Amino acid sequence: KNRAARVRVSKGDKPVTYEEAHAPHYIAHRKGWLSLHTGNLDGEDHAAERTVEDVFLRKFMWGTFPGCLADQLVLKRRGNQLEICAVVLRQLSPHKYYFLVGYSETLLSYFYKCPVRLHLQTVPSKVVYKYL
């Protein structure tokens, strides 16, 4: 039996998001990609570097906004701009989100030598697609 990225059935009590509910074969069919860049197009370079950066940014944001991320990150690259789009919860005070946005945008811009912007969308609770 296939295991990769498959939230297995339970007793009908496990809330899953739209992303978590779709196995890999639905990628490009029912769900899109969580990062968009040009490195994986034919004749394009630096796919290795873009991939390492994405893995870091996902770990960095997970530990920088602990308990706040309500879904996977969406990473967008245009030119030398890096856009991080995250769906977060409404538990942390707004002051802490502004501190962490200013802090994260600055630190990541100096780390990867590019203008980095963070776009936060808040939801009252994790959006549930279905109960597996």
């Binding site: 030119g79 030398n80 701009q81 811009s109 590019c114 203008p115």
Partner: protein, 131 residues
Amino acid sequence: TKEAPETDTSPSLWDVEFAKQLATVNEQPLQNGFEELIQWTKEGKLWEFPINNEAGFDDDGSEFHEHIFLEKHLESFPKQGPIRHFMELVTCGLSKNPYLSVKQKVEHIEWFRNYFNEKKDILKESNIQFN
């Protein structure tokens, strides 16, 4: 008004600081997303458009004939024989290398010039006369 300015006037702390008080009177938060791009472009953070893949990279102002014509650098080598034939292949290959600066190409040539000087005795045995 003053007809000839003091172009080489020194920037005293009093003058550098006063110029910072004149940049604070027009200091306002960004109004929209276009102004953020304009600010990043002035600061150098954002790429300039249209895209130029050579932006910020001039190879020391070198001309094409400095990369492709390297025989002026073999004047210290013998004019005939195997050492000339060998160095014509080195310079031929260096003249086809777009990944090296003129400085680096000269370094390759200078390395062989010194290498063959240390091997003068060995070369004399083979009837080759390097300087």
